[PDB]
Amino acid sequence: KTHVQLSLPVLQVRDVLVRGFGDSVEEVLSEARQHLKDGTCGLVEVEKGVLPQLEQPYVFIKRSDAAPHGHVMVELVAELEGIQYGRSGETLGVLVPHVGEIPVAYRKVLLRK
Numbered sequence: 001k002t003h004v005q006l007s008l009p010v011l012q013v014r015d016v017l018v019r020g021f022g023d024s025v026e027e028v029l030s031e032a033r034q035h036l037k038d039g040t041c042g043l044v045e046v047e048k049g050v051l052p053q054l055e056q057p058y059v060f061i062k063r064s065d066a067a068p069h070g071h072v073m074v075e076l077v078a079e080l081e082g083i084q085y086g087r088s089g090e091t092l093g094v095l096v097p098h099v100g101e102i103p104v105a106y107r108k109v110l111l112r113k
Contacts, residue, residue, distance in 0.1 A: 020055030
């Protein structure tokens with residue numbers, strides 16, 4: 001399937017134990033996709049002061065269209081030193097590994113895979 005329905009746990013930035021996916025744009029996109037498939041991916045909602053508390057490269061989920069079954073259609077865009085790899089819509093948040101942090105909410109997305 002080109003798309004997969006996922007329910008992503010929304011984590012508070014100060015709770016996150018593993019603050020990124022790796023060391024290159026290509027590695028973080030790879031790892032983010034693997035964690036999304038394995039159900040071990042969390043989402044941090046971006047506000048003032050969140051991104052400096054996380055590790056670059058960043059992986060964003062961005063709205064790819066205007067929402068089947070409640071699920072917003074999203075795709076992945078990486079960012080390293082102010083350059084983005086991918087082009088998409090509004091940021092829904094930044095992806096991080098989930099290692100058992102308690103979420104504040106869930107975000108239903110349809111991920112272009």
